[PDB]
Assembly symmetry: C2
Homo-oligomer: 306 residues x 2
Amino acid sequence: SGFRKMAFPSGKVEGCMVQVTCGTTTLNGLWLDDVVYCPRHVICTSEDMLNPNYEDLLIRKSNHNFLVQAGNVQLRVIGHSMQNCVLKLKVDTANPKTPKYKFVRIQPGQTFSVLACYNGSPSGVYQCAMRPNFTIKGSFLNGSCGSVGFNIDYDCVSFCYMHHMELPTGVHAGTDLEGNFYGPFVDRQTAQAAGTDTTITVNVLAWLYAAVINGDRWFLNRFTTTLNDFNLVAMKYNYEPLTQDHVDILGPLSAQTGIAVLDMCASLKELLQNGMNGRTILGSALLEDEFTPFDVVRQCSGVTFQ
Amino acid sequence: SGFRKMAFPSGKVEGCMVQVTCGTTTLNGLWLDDVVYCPRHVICTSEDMLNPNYEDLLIRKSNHNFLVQAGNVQLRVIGHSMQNCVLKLKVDTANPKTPKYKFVRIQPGQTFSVLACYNGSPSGVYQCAMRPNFTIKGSFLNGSCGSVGFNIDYDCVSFCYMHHMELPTGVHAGTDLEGNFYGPFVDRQTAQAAGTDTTITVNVLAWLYAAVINGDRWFLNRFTTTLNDFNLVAMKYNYEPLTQDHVDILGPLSAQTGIAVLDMCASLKELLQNGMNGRTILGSALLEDEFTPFDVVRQCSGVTFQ
């Protein structure tokens, strides 16, 4: 038993990370088949980023102004194009380590693993959630841009995130691999408002189920509630409203533990209104919202990938 | 910026995980060069584990009596030996994916990444600390034994942990790769007392430095203290005593932030006596002790591997 925030094994993604240099800027790119994907602000200096005209800056560049290096292998750039906020660099060679892969646009509240990289080399791997306001709370230093987020399904890598920027507030924003930002953000160094962030209610509930499965039960009370009654308490505490779709997704956890979903919502409502009174749940003194119901089931059955 | 509990990239280790079956028991093994390492209780039935005589049970087995599978290709077992609590199964072929590697015995309070595996296939990766009482708080289901813990230094994998068992209390115990248990535990299914666990003081201070580096500063108070006075408060809250060696290890973090170590100990001592009063540090409502000073420097400096 036990419950840990677990990232996916990063091997399949490590073999796809390359270094992209344009002028003085170096960042990470993703090499799949014969295309390298990277943030388009690789073509910007630190001064361009204040107000960049990406179409005009890209026109000043040719294929040989893009230095792409995979480990110690230099790749030959034979074409370049801009798709929304990503650059696609066509190279001479197909990546021999290309895994089975998909490009996916995930929804707020879904989670993914981030392979943080610098200069095309992997630094570490951790799990993240796309917040309801479409930011993430990562660990990204200078040079991390182009680091990617992903999920793995047996042998297929679903790429869902590419890192582009840190907002002045210290949170992180990026795109899917078609180059469309999550949220209202733009790849410009300016003040950018993230909306109010809220707690992913269905994720907290799944984590309470994981706690029950692991023997933590002190928070189980003798109340229940209704969906509408819970959502009144949800909006006071900046929690996302619970829908019937979320109740349905929690069905299997309900079935395994024998605790009805609206009964778990009554325990959650008393945790929100009374706090935790110095207690902990699964080693945490806060309510955790970074596990999806599918994450909880995965960790609890021990699914493998290879 | 930002600070996350980060695991090492697991690619080099994924290529070494194999499946070891002996009779009805299946667990994970580690294939390095022409040797497969796995827990010796793979040779036990579920009933043998109550009082196993490993020498007698191993004698009933021959080289062909061990099924080693790497992905879908089977290996040729040409020798077997027991070294303390691990089995060394000599196979015909050297693992072509063998990384540069060392076997190391770590100290309490040091950290490592765990590649959780089932049936020889990787399931997930997370960072763990060896507790002062020589347990770890992992996530390990049935079939997870033989999962390994490791650190990476550029290109060399330092293997430090092999998972062997879950104690009845739900915490986890295992060996180094010479088969010597960490702590007073044995590979027998019986009640086994872990000692009192204490908090890794030097790790908490490193994490407080990481918090300051990342902009969290409210806990900086304007008192100081001495080493003996801090250790008086440390022992009341089940913290491990701080030594001069620990002060020295924190030196570079001290130098970067301009905060002397004993001033950081005064902020910690008031955090222990007053709690956090509903505040958080790096998103946590508890004091974190799973980052070593070297972990903090690595993450804040962006060191990369391979």
